[PDB]
Design a protein around this motif. Structure first.
Motif, PDB file in Angstrom:
ATOM      1  N   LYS A  97       0.812  -1.219   0.000  1.00  0.00           N
ATOM      2  CA  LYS A  97       0.000   0.000   0.000  1.00  0.00           C
ATOM      3  C   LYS A  97       0.848   1.274   0.000  1.00  0.00           C
ATOM      4  O   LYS A  97       0.476   2.271  -0.636  1.00  0.00           O
ATOM      5  CB  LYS A  97      -0.960  -0.016   1.191  1.00  0.00           C
ATOM      6  N   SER A 108      -5.229   8.469   2.921  1.00  0.00           N
ATOM      7  CA  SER A 108      -6.616   8.651   3.339  1.00  0.00           C
ATOM      8  C   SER A 108      -7.634   8.268   2.266  1.00  0.00           C
ATOM      9  O   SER A 108      -8.769   7.913   2.605  1.00  0.00           O
ATOM     10  CB  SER A 108      -6.843  10.102   3.770  1.00  0.00           C
ATOM     11  N   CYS A 109      -7.272   8.331   0.984  1.00  0.00           N
ATOM     12  CA  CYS A 109      -8.080   7.728  -0.076  1.00  0.00           C
ATOM     13  C   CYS A 109      -7.188   7.140  -1.163  1.00  0.00           C
ATOM     14  O   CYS A 109      -6.436   7.860  -1.824  1.00  0.00           O
ATOM     15  CB  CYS A 109      -9.092   8.745  -0.633  1.00  0.00           C
ATOM     16  N   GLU A 110      -7.288   5.816  -1.327  1.00  0.00           N
ATOM     17  CA  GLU A 110      -6.382   4.962  -2.093  1.00  0.00           C
ATOM     18  C   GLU A 110      -6.513   5.110  -3.610  1.00  0.00           C
ATOM     19  O   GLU A 110      -5.691   4.543  -4.337  1.00  0.00           O
ATOM     20  CB  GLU A 110      -6.652   3.511  -1.669  1.00  0.00           C
ATOM     21  N   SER A 111      -7.510   5.849  -4.094  1.00  0.00           N
ATOM     22  CA  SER A 111      -7.888   5.855  -5.508  1.00  0.00           C
ATOM     23  C   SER A 111      -6.733   6.195  -6.446  1.00  0.00           C
ATOM     24  O   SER A 111      -6.101   7.248  -6.321  1.00  0.00           O
ATOM     25  CB  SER A 111      -9.038   6.836  -5.726  1.00  0.00           C
ATOM     26  N   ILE A 112      -6.470   5.289  -7.392  1.00  0.00           N
ATOM     27  CA  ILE A 112      -5.432   5.498  -8.399  1.00  0.00           C
ATOM     28  C   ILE A 112      -5.874   6.537  -9.426  1.00  0.00           C
ATOM     29  O   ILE A 112      -5.050   7.305  -9.941  1.00  0.00           O
ATOM     30  CB  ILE A 112      -5.068   4.158  -9.069  1.00  0.00           C
ATOM     31  N   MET A 115       1.741   1.613  -3.497  1.00  0.00           N
ATOM     32  CA  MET A 115       0.567   2.091  -4.225  1.00  0.00           C
ATOM     33  C   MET A 115       0.395   3.603  -4.119  1.00  0.00           C
ATOM     34  O   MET A 115       0.207   4.277  -5.135  1.00  0.00           O
ATOM     35  CB  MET A 115      -0.699   1.379  -3.747  1.00  0.00           C
ATOM     36  N   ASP A 135      -9.077   8.684  -9.148  1.00  0.00           N
ATOM     37  CA  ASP A 135      -9.896   9.811  -8.713  1.00  0.00           C
ATOM     38  C   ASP A 135     -10.368   9.636  -7.274  1.00  0.00           C
ATOM     39  O   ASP A 135     -11.174   8.748  -6.978  1.00  0.00           O
ATOM     40  CB  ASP A 135     -11.101   9.964  -9.650  1.00  0.00           C
ATOM     41  N   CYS A 136      -9.875  10.493  -6.381  1.00  0.00           N
ATOM     42  CA  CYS A 136     -10.531  10.812  -5.120  1.00  0.00           C
ATOM     43  C   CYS A 136     -10.077  12.193  -4.665  1.00  0.00           C
ATOM     44  O   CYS A 136      -9.006  12.672  -5.046  1.00  0.00           O
ATOM     45  CB  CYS A 136     -10.257   9.727  -4.064  1.00  0.00           C
TER      46      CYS A 136
END
Ligand SMILES: *[C@@H]1O[C@H](CO)[C@@H](O)[C@H](O)[C@H]1NC(C)=O
Ligand SMILES: *[C@@H]1O[C@H](CO)[C@@H](O)[C@H](O)[C@H]1NC(C)=O
Ligand SMILES: *[C@@H]1O[C@H](CO)[C@@H](O)[C@H](O)[C@H]1NC(C)=O
Ligand SMILES: *[C@@H]1O[C@H](CO)[C@@H](O)[C@H](O)[C@H]1NC(C)=O
Ligand SMILES: *[C@@H]1O[C@H](CO)[C@@H](O)[C@H](O)[C@H]1NC(C)=O
Ligand SMILES: *[C@@H]1O[C@H](CO)[C@@H](O)[C@H](O)[C@H]1NC(C)=O
Ligand SMILES: *[C@@H]1O[C@H](CO)[C@@H](O)[C@H](O)[C@H]1NC(C)=O
Ligand SMILES: *[C@@H]1O[C@H](CO)[C@@H](O)[C@H](O)[C@H]1NC(C)=O
Ligand SMILES: [Ca+2]
Ligand SMILES: [Ca+2]
Ligand SMILES: [Ca+2]
Ligand SMILES: [Ca+2]
Lengths: 696, 609, 105, 180
Positions: free
Chosen positions: C1, C39-43, C4, C45-46
């Motif tokens: 992670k 805090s937000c994993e989005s590759i 990531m 969009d977040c």
């Protein structure tokens, strides 16, 4: 659009560009990888000059080690083959250990002799570095150091690519000492027709030079030549010319697993006892390696005849002719397949806990409406109708359970049987002494103290008095049923049928459509997972119900799926009057499903749900019911075929009395014309003269 | 019993049910607190009331309310199998299940059992599960000698099929569409949720991770070895194509996968993120369709890539649910600049500059007339989400010009017995026949089925191996053509069981085949072609079943084959009635010899029409 | 992670930003991107991911290194809601890589 | 636009609508919370009739305990004051132990004598339930049970709002005797 490198024999290395050299390693060394930016690293691991492992590192986030003995380690943990993670696939191919990463654009292998090889896609042309060289049209611009210089010395190059670690920090290696009727064995590369086919593609002179070097290094016989011949043949294969004769035009046979044989041009997509056929849509080039003999098949890495192939079920292997069974159906293993029976089996409708349901067609659901509801009826011939009374069973609004059951039996002169809370029974409103046998109807105390009811062979019921009802129907009723337990037609997909003849997609409107009374409230929405209304309960509900998915039930997990029972358990424990009792009821419900599939689980323990018996009785996880009561002595010709079951039993020499106490056979009362006589009682009459002994 | 609180007649919905067991004239029932005729009561669906003569549509079928019940059409609708996530599948029968896997698996194939297969569809997660890219599935379609791969958002016909005249590749909204024939089609979400659609001509012919297309959810999870697995992981592992590739690890139901696995708090933030599926925009769809499977999938595929925004894992699950809702006619306007937005402005940034023709639509019509597709198609879906060109009247879209343009632009034997008969063949699948002998028993059955007028009129046939259970390959109600029934009878497999219970196959014919006599005009006969003994402990009910069959007027013909047929059961069958004539044979080789007197005895024991 | 979030924040080092990465250091904003993408994993969009890139793009635009970093997949912004007006779908609104500030209104 | 609940003295309770009663609690009980959907639960913890802790549960993802002795515990780990997490703030105000959650729309306090009080924003008007009552203009209708019926009896009401846990299975409380 690919190139290959290898590390082979004693000490030798062949680059992606066909430059060859010798290097005895003591560190672990970069073989290949992205040179300017390192997407992956392929590492050769050595000890005392010998190879011991091929290790791939992906960025810095993952690493996998493949040893020459076929051990594999991920990070610092040993892992069984085959394996697949992070886009790498690690497997056996042609009897040899393979490590593929063609998403990253490489594949690698270790053969049975411990020779490494690596293949890079054209993605890495002129963009790689390490002991396998720099992958470009030139062979002589290899030996590029990590310092970016060339060197004329292979040991300066290879030590330049050494990689130390916290496991060991490593010395600069150096050439071994030397002091040099077999030499003709190396000249096979030049003299012998099968090798001579490849001279337009691969020059033999480096390989025969390396062969003469291994003949100097090696203490064995003529086999000391073989790694150079093998690597020449593999180089020719990479150049597109397979050397089909090479291993019998010479004494050299490569190592292979037991029962396999080495051959050239083994196909990918190798067939096995367990694998469906791709009908040649494999679309991949052949490789050298081990094969099973022709007409023999591989199974879990061993060769077996096509007639010997095991079937697999429940994650286990079974020989042909083995019979398994699911419910009443049997499955017999033949060839790769199970010949499975297609008959309908007895339907077990269930109501349990906080108004969880199982349809006759095995559909699990929860409804929790409060009313009289039609559970199960013969809608064709109306031979029986079963109704449940559901009530709120705690302070929670989501805690709803069956209080009582009603059975109407039109064939039994329209008798009405009510099964009451606390396991009492009334018939036509009159409370009855439970052992009842009039007509086709029979009612009995189960060893669980649950009421059991039977109505011929085709209907049976088992009511615990605490809101659990199990209903069993014979296949005579298949397709004929109606109510909350569905139509018993073998299909889940229509169990939410309703009296209007459509299936409601909402369990609420489905259940509402079976309510018997008009002033009962329609359930608007069923609130799944009620732990939100008592958050204090959720931590225990999770920690306790997770036992259903723990190893203690593991034997059952492939006989009955635990997931509906786990959902039911967490609902029950989160929303009922005593979560300990609701826990034990949910665990017992799953264990009962296991026993219905013939798996018996020792799930009770002093920390949870001990079935503590009254004095003189003893607990059994499985005891035989048919000979427990004194009545069994008094009617010893009666039919009884019921299976061994969990409960409280008298010790092996004693029978159970009306007081629940355990008595020797000589002390049982006798039952005659439904009337009870003590031991050694006499009566004599104008019709008969009789006496009570041994409970008869 | 302390109480804090204290305090037949029939209504339109309850009239068919039991009385309460705890008020109008005869032939009359209450509605709205008034007694009314039953023929005026409404029907119920969705919990809603509809008057008699009102009509409702359910999928492709439709039903009119008649005498308080739904008088439906009997069509079989186009069944959809779908990959609905990174690791989730929904069968043709609607069974949602979880199956992660790094290998390549058969999503669906036609090559099932004996059936000559027309196609396969293969899927796998190859190249996922690592940091450098968001995950994408491969697809591989192998229809009629061709090969189409779908990957990286692109379609690649790697091999031309044997007849391209039935093949179209289409795009609509954000969805690729492929039509592979009149009865097979694919709809591809480039973000993982691959979908496959079949017409009623396939049904039980197909198998794979999609299950087998029939009514019956419970016979999905049938492994490639033909055994139903209790665990979806073992089922899915059986459909692994590559023999050497790693089987998916079985694991407990941990509370959630991946990034949630340690992180219960953030898992509840995933749960709230998925509550879009239960918001007021979806709540009208949530009547017709259950949101719970798609919400569970959203948990799994947001605990994979924890987000409230367009990661390939998350917004996919809601786009898929919206797509299913739109196929149910409930279009959902769910995307916004606040949540999972899409921008078609790159399509309006044209060679002339910025010009409006494209915009997002909640669902645009699919397979539209286009310069790339000059005529309508048998499109598998009603409408689909995404960018759509809102062309003025009569103009045709050109996709390569990205613009609207003018439409001017761009019998077998002499014995053929024809009489009122129901016939069942009961075949001893024990080891006491080899497979080579059982082939002769099969040939005997098949050739008798050449000599009888097989139909629902005249002679009905069932064919049943028992092998220590009971295994009807054909039942009396199977309306298939006689050459199809003979084909199936020849395709009867061989068990070779260690036991073959004669008593339990008699039980099966007594209770499950002849559950009720639906042809009182026909005679009914069982050829008990028995070759093995039962073990003694099993036989105890045998006389009860054969005498019950006599009570049900089923003639039982015990054909004892070979030395291991227990002659006791043969003669005990004869003792029940003179009609129960035995035959006893030294081998299967004289089944085909005695065939004439056997089949003629059947026809002598059956009445003319 | 961890890798990531790191690789996801490599948008700041991609060739569309590399012209800005001369005049401005990407590393501080990348560190914020690591923290926010945790805090937000989005590759793709977040909000936390997209805003830390948009903050770097804003700094670049203030250095004159205007950058067209968003796409229909990478953190899309959609103005099509503002186009729907009393004329129907009318062409005036678009995403601009930078709108001039405080235009006469 | 706020209303106040109190639990004070020995045994007494005052609802959001001003109804008052005595309740010798022996378990933990819902004081207030979202009634139709439970965004939070505010829980009064009792032992041997005495109050001992005021607790808040947020969905099911977080739980915080504030004792009458000023100990604070989150989950099962003791935590020092002041504290702030999940949008709650837990602090001393005017010498008294304050727990605030005005993002959720509430605040609560324990004074030095151990009296609880709970305050709800108008967000929860006619939308809350528990020992603090239903928060509406009417006050005679505060004794709404979890079963959904208005009892005349304050112990039936309070016991109806008892919440068990794996550590604490609730016994039913009943009125103690007195010599008065
Ligand atoms: C394989 O070899 C390595 C060292 O090279 C050793 O650690 C491991 O235990 C070996 N495995 C077996 C099964 O012998
Ligand atoms: C290989 O890369 C170097 C730069 O590192 C370049 O100078 C050379 O021309 C390249 N060779 C080929 C054949 O592309
Ligand atoms: C009941 O039968 C079992 C054998 O099935 C035997 O072990 C047991 O002792 C018997 N019970 C009595 C009281 O004899
Ligand atoms: C539907 O209605 C028609 C006309 O009354 C009738 O012939 C048919 O049998 C009905 N079918 C069903 C399933 O109700
Ligand atoms: C496009 O969207 C509108 C709603 O904005 C809808 O009414 C219409 O049916 C959709 N499709 C087409 C082709 O306009
Ligand atoms: C608006 O966007 C365009 C590109 O779409 C850009 O060239 C222009 O400078 C921006 N500003 C103005 C005022 O047009
Ligand atoms: C505060 O009270 C609780 C409950 O009696 C107790 O567990 C805790 O230890 C007490 N703390 C101190 C500091 O006395
Ligand atoms: C309070 O809510 C109920 C619904 O539960 C409603 O019937 C009642 O009118 C409401 N009262 C006020 C004052 O809002
Ligand atoms: Ca080179
Ligand atoms: Ca059903
Ligand atoms: Ca099926
Ligand atoms: Ca009030």
């Amino acid at each position: 659009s690919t190139a290959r490198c290898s590390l082979f024999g004693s000490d030798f290395v062949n680059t992606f560009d066909g430059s060859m050299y010798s290097f005895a390693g003591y560190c672990s060394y970069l073989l290949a990888g992205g040179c300017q930016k390192r997407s992956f690293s392929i590492i050769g691991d050595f000890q005392n000059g010998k190879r011991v492992s091929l290790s791939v590192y992906l960025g810095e986030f993952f690493d996998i080690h493949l040893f020459v003995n076929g051990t594999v380690t991920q990070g610092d943990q040993r892992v069984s083959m085959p394996y697949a993670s992070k886009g790498l696939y690690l497997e056996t191919e042609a009897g040899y250990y393979k490590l593929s990463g063609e998403a990253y654009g490489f594949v690698a292998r270790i053969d049975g002799s411990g020779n490494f090889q690596v293949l890079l896609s054209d993605r890495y042309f002129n963009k790689t570095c390490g002991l396998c060289g720099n992958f470009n049209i030139f062979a002589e611009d290899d030996f590029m150091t990590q310092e970016g210089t060339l060197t004329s010395d292979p040991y300066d190059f290879a030590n330049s690519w050494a990689l130390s670690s916290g496991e060991q920090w490593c010395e600069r290696a150096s050439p071994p000492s030397s002091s040099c009727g077999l030499w003709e064995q190396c000249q096979l590369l030049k003299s012998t027709s099968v090798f001579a086919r490849c001279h337009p593609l691969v020059d033999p002179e480096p390989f025969v030079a390396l062969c003469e070097k291994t003949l100097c290094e090696c203490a064995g016989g003529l086999e000391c030549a073989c790694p150079a011949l093998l690597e020449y043949a593999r180089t020719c294969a990479q150049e597109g010319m397979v050397l089909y004769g090479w291993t019998d035009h010479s004494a050299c046979s490569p190592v292979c697993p037991a029962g396999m044989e080495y051959r050239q041009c083994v196909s990918p997509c190798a067939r096995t006892c367990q694998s469906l056929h791709i009908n040649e849509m494999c679309q991949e080039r052949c490789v050298d390696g081990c094969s099973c003999p022709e007409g023999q098949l591989l199974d879990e890495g061993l060769c077996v005849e096509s007639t010997e192939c095991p079937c697999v079920h429940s994650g286990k292997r079974y020989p042909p002719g083995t019979s398994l069974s699911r419910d009443c159906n049997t499955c017999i293993c033949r060839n790769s397949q199970w010949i499975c029976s297609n008959e309908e089996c007895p339907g077990e409708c269930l109501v349990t806990g906080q108004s969880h349901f199982k349809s006759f067609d095995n559909r699990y659901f929860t409804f929790s409406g409060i009313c009289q509801y039609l559970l199960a009826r013969d809608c064709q011939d109306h031979s029986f109708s079963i109704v449940i009374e559901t009530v709120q069973c705690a302070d929670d609004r989501d805690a709803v359970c069956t209080r009582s059951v009603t059975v109407r039996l039109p064939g039994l002169h329209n008798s009405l049987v009510k099964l009451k809370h606390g396991a009492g029974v009334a018939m036509d409103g009159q409370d009855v002494q439970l052992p009842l046998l009039k007509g086709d109807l029979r009612i009995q105390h189960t060893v669980t103290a649950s009421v059991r009811l039977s109505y011929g062979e085709d209907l049976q019921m088992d009511w615990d008095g605490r809101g659990r009802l199990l209903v069993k129907l014979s296949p005579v009723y298949a397709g004929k049923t109606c109510g909350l337990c569905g139509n018993y037609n073998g299909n889940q997909g229509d169990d939410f049928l309703t009296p209007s003849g459509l299936a409601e997609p909402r369990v609420e409107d489905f259940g509402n459509a079976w309510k018997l009374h008009g002033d009962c409230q329609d359930l608007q929405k069923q609130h799944s997972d009620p732990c939100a209304l008592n958050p204090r309960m959720t931590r225990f509900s999770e920690e306790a119900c997770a036992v259903l998915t723990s190893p203690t039930f593991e034997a059952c997990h492939r006989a009955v799926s635990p997931l509906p029972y786990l959902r039911n358990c967490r609902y029950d424990v989160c929303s009922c009057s005593d979560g300990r009792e609701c826990l034990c009821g949910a665990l017992a419900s799953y264990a009962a499903a296991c026993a219905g599939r013939g798996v018996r689980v020792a799930w009770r323990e002093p920390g949870r749900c001990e079935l503590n018996c009254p004095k003189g009785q003893v607990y059994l996880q499985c005891g035989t019911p048919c000979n427990l009561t004194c009545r069994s002595l008094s009617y010893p010709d009666e039919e009884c075929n019921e299976a061994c079951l969990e409960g409280c039993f008298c010790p092996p020499g004693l029978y159970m009395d009306e007081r629940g106490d355990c008595v020797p056979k000589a002390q049982c009362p006798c039952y005659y014309d439904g009337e009870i006589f003590q031991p050694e009682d006499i009566f004599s009459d104008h019709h008969t003269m009789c006496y009570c002994e041994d409970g008869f | 019993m302390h109480c804090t609180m204290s305090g037949c007649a029939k209504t339109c919905q309850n009239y068919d049910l039991e009385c309460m067991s705890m008020l109008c004239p005869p032939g009359m029932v209450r509605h709205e607190n008034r007694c009314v005729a039953l023929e005026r009561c409404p029907c119920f669906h969705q919990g809603k009331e509809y008057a008699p003569g009102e009509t409702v549509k359910i999928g492709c079928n439709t039903c009119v309310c008649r005498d308080r019940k739904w008088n439906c059409t009997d069509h079989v609708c186009d069944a959809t199998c779908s990959t609905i996530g990174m690791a989730h599948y929904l069968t043709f029968d609607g069974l949602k299940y979880l199956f992660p896997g790094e290998c390549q698996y058969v999503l669906v194939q036609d090559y099932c059992g004996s059936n000559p297969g027309t196609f396969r569809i293969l899927v796998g997660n190859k190249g996922c599960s690592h940091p450098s890219v968001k995950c994408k599935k491969r697809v591989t379609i192998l229809v009629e000698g061709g090969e189409i791969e779908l990957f990286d958002g692109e379609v690649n016909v790697k091999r031309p099929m044997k007849d391209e005249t039935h093949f179209e590749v289409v795009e609509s909204g954000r969805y690729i569409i492929l039509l592979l024939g009149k009865a097979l089609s694919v709809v591809w979400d480039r973000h993982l949720s691959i979908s496959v659609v079949l017409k009623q001509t396939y049904q039980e012919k197909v198998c794979g991770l999609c299950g087998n297309f029939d009514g019956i959810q419970n016979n999905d999870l049938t492994s490639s070895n033909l055994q139903v697995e209790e665990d979806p992981v073992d089922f899915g592992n059986s459909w692994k194509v590559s023999s050497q590739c790693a089987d998916t690890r079985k694991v407990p139901l941990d509370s959630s996968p991946a990034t949630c696995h340690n992180n219960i708090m953030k898992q509840t933030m995933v749960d709230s993120s998925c509550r879009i599926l239960t918001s007021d925009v979806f709540q009208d769809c949530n009547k017709l369709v259950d949101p719970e499977p798609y919400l569970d999938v959203c948990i799994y595929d947001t605990c994979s890539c924890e987000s409230i925004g367009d990661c390939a894992c998350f917004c996919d699950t809601i786009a898929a649910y919206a797509h299913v809702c739109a196929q149910h006619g409930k279009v959902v306007t769910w995307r916004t600049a606040t949540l999972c937005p899409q921008s078609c402005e790159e399509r309006n940034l044209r060679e002339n500059g910025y010009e409006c023709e494209w915009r997002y639509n909640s669902c645009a019509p699919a397979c539209q007339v286009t310069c790339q597709h000059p005529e309508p198609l048998a499109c598998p879906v009603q409408c689909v989400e995404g960018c759509h060109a809102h062309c003025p009247p009569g103009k045709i879209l050109d996709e390569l010009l990205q613009t609207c343009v003018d439409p001017e632009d761009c019998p077998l034997h002499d014995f053929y017995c024809s009489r009122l008969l129901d016939l069942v063949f009961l075949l001893d699948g024990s080891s006491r026949l080899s497979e080579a002998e059982f082939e002769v028993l099969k040939a005997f059955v098949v050739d008798m089925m050449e000599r009888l007028r097989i139909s629902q009129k005249w002679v009905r046939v069932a064919v049943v191996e028992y092998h220590d259970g009971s295994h009807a390959y054909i039942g009396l109600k199977d309306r298939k053509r006689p050459s199809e029934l003979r084909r199936i009878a020849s395709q009867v497999k061989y068990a070779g069981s260690q036991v073959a219970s004669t008593s339990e196959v008699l039980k099966y014919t007594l209770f499950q085949i002849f559950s009720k006599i639906d042809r009182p005009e026909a005679s009914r006969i069982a050829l008990l072609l028995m070759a093995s003994q039962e073990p003694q402990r099993m036989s105890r009910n045998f006389v009860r079943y054969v005498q019950g069959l006599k009570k049900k007027k089923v003639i039982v013909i015990p054909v004892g084959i070979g030395p291991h047929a227990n002659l006791k059961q043969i003669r005990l069958i004869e003792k029940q009635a003179p009609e129960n004539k035995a035959f006893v044979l030294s081998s299967v080789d004289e089944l085909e010899q005695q065939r004439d007197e056997i089949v003629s005895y059947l026809c002598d024991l059956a009445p003319e029409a």
